[PDB]
Design a protein around this ligand. Structure first.
Ligand SMILES: Cc1cc2nc3c(=O)[nH]c(=O)nc-3n(C[C@H](O)[C@H](O)[C@H](O)COP(=O)(O)OP(=O)(O)OC[C@H]3O[C@@H](n4cnc5c(N)ncnc54)[C@H](O)[C@@H]3O)c2cc1C
Ligand SMILES: Cc1cc2nc3c(=O)[nH]c(=O)nc-3n(C[C@H](O)[C@H](O)[C@H](O)COP(=O)(O)OP(=O)(O)OC[C@H]3O[C@@H](n4cnc5c(N)ncnc54)[C@H](O)[C@@H]3O)c2cc1C
Ligand SMILES: [Ca+2]
Ligand SMILES: [Ca+2]
Lengths: 391, 391
């Protein structure tokens, strides 16, 4: 059970890496703790940066984006009882974002991995990653009750925030930067058409809310809630009540209601670990970093990490240039710290912080006024939201 | 004992107002608790926004700015061991700031008020402001141990953060927004030439420092220190030691030392009160709001308030219309919240916060990288630093 690149985790980062390597003739094996069906149908991300769309297209997995996706040009910020449509397409000088949800991406990537005969082991939790400075690393997993081992030149830690790979970094080398925000998000899908054509952010003093969309007939909505909230405490009526209160404004169509499903609570957390590599182990995606999702940056950052990592592995195996592996972490971190900055700035501006200093609270409205109401503020939002360059 | 506008405080705001009113034939009396030369020589502001410079020139009190002022085009941000010269003249579309210190402004304004026979009462602490909704307001003061009272149509509260006018606002009307930062500034003047032509900000992990200037032979320096710090704990050697450590970088000239004077510790605080008027009382300047001084905004904001207040009083007395007095507070507050935002943003970025969450601390460097290293970041800094528009 030997390969060139062992990939822990068959989420979007791991599948994209396997596919990119396969296209370049580099052998990989993916090892995934969950059932394949469970992985595919996780509902998380909705929105892709333009750089991500280009990357999916260029890797041959973007064919359904035009028909299934929805191109986005503006965010409608609701606050002070008014709509503030920020055209980030214009402000960024023509760059866009797309609704194209994570489960579609993962479906596309699993399809591409299967057609390339990429071996993926499911229901195969990795328990240990060994030999990071040995001549080859060892991935120790269990499957069907029995212990297995993958030996490989490099291990890609693509196993998300609660994976094993980040804790496989030697702790004398790793440094964590971690901030948990004092709220979560209650998220739902609703069989109800979007009330307006733009993704809409309710920056209310009851709390944050969002109306995003999946199709002309399905909306994806979020409500700021208590940290560790019990979804059972939110009847459908309570959910629509807070959504209306936080989003609706005079002169814009009222939010449309419909049957709710996929109700769940997620955390709001900024986390980054340095370095993103050590010896034969390279961390990518949520294993290396997470952000609060207001700015639609996590899957996009994972894809940026994998773009760098795949290219670096190709340079090492095909072109006799191992220096790009050596600078993987340095390059991914420069981008990731700016993404962290932007995701934090959105998070601290649009959510209500319980018991917050009143001056700091009133600056939230100043920040919203400035961001939506000035050329410079709109520019910064637009260039960041549609996706920073990748090195 | 009867006048048209009674002005509490002969700082820059009060003297500017008295002078602007004098030029329009509106009678004012200024009542000041301290001695004249004490007020004149307070060591505070050094830097003026372009708008403030234009205001002084238009008022006939700007003739010395060219002679003893110093036009500024850039801030040199020192961090990560490197110099980062942000040309805000270029990034603001040609606007500037000037070194022209507060004591020179006040000297100019005192001279102009004296030449105009504006009565100014020194060593005359105002005790109470009464009759805000009576047919005329009453300013009760003491001077030479005798009680006095000035009756007026309007009271301009220009008596600074620790004055009496803010507390004369009915407390059921007023709302404060207050945030103290966990550090102060130790400030000095040094008879030492500036080591480089630009005001230089030391954004170091030891704490903030600044090298500003007054002349080719006099520098104005600040060090972040503990809140409520004792200047006695800072020998000259300790002062220069920390200034060198926080400012000097390789490849730029080293800070020059010279004899030190006017050592003092000042607070770092964001405060705003709403509204800025009630009945016949109008607050202006530090009486109404303070900011942490990193961005050189307090005197400039005081002058913005006075520009609006004087024009409103002139419209009321001289063009017969009183709608502009009615909107004084609404207009000054819109500008002032954006000033608060900017001053707060600089303050939280360039000072070390003891025991801060490490993720938030590391965002300080991201904020510095983005501000200095992107067009959008430079634009926003430059437009704000050189001074926002006044309504
Ligand atoms: C509510 C919400 C909304 C979001 N919206 C957006 C958005 O609009 N845009 C965007 O760009 N991002 C968004 N994100 C972030 C995005 O979903 C994540 O950043 C993304 O899932 C990261 O992918 P990944 O492959 O790095 O990790 P994951 O998707 O978490 O995949 C990791 C995989 O590793 C597997 N694994 C775990 N432990 C082991 C183990 N021991 N052995 C083997 N396998 C293991 C897991 O089963 C999982 O399949 C959102 C997130 C949330 C919560
Ligand atoms: C270290 C430092 C650096 C600064 N740098 C800058 C800068 O570069 N640029 C900038 O724009 N701003 C700067 N500022 C801010 C600026 O100094 C203040 O905002 C400015 O002094 C405000 O002027 P004012 O007239 O509103 O109040 P003040 O200057 O405080 O004057 C109010 C007057 O009222 C008097 N008074 C008080 N109580 C009474 C009473 N009961 N009766 C009568 N009179 C009374 C006081 O004696 C005083 O003379 C700085 C401040 C500090 C501390
Ligand atoms: Ca109801
Ligand atoms: Ca009366």
């Amino acid at each position: 059970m030997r390969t060139q690149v062992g990939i822990v985790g068959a989420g979007p980062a791991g599948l994209m890496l396997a596919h990119l390597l396969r296209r370049e003739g580099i052998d990989a094996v993916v090892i995934e703790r969950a059932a394949r069906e469970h992985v595919r149908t996780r509902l998380r991300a909705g929105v892709l940066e333009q750089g991500t769309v280009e990357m999916l297209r260029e890797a041959g997995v973007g064919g359904r984006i035009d028909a299934v996706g929805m191109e986005m040009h503006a965010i409608d910020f609701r606050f002070g009882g008014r709509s503030h449509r920020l055209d980030f397409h214009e402000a960024s000088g023509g760059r866009r974002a797309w609704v194209y949800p994570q489960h579609e991406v993962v479906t596309d990537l699993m399809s591409a991995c299967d057609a390339g005969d990429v071996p993926i082991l499911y229901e195969a939790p990795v328990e240990r990653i060994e030999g990071l400075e040995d001549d080859r690393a060892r991935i120790v997993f269990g499957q069907d009750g029995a212990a297995g081992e993958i030996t490989c030149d490099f291990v890609a830690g693509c196993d998300g925030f609660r994976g094993v790979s980040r804790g496989s970094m030697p702790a004398g080398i790793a440094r964590g930067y971690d901030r948990i925000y004092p709220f979560g998000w209650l998220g739902i899908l609703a069989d109800a058409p979007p009330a307006s054509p733009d993704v809409t952010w309710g920056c209310s003093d009851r709390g944050f809310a969002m109306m995003s969309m999946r199709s002309p007939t399905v909306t994806r909505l979020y409500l700021q809630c208590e940290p560790d909230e019990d979804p059972d405490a939110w009847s459908d009526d309570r959910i629509w009540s807070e959504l209306h209160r936080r989003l609706d404004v005079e002169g814009m169509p009222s939010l449309r209601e419909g049957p709710i499903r996929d109700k769940g609570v997620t955390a709001m957390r900024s986390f980054l670990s340095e370095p993103m590599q050590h010896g034969r182990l390279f961390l990518a995606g949520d294993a290396a970093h997470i952000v609060p999702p207001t700015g639609a940056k996590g899957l996009n950052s994972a894809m940026a990490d994998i773009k760098v990592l795949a290219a670096a592995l190709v340079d090492h195996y095909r072109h006799g240039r191992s220096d790009r592996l050596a600078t993987y972490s340095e390059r991914c971190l420069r981008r990731m710290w700016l993404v962290q900055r932007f995701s934090a700035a959105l998070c601290t501006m649009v959510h209500q912080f319980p018991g917050q200093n009143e001056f700091v609270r009133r600056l939230q409205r100043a920040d919203l006024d400035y961001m939506t109401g000035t050329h410079a503020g709109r520019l910064q939002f637009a260039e960041n939201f549609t996706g920073l360059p990748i090195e």
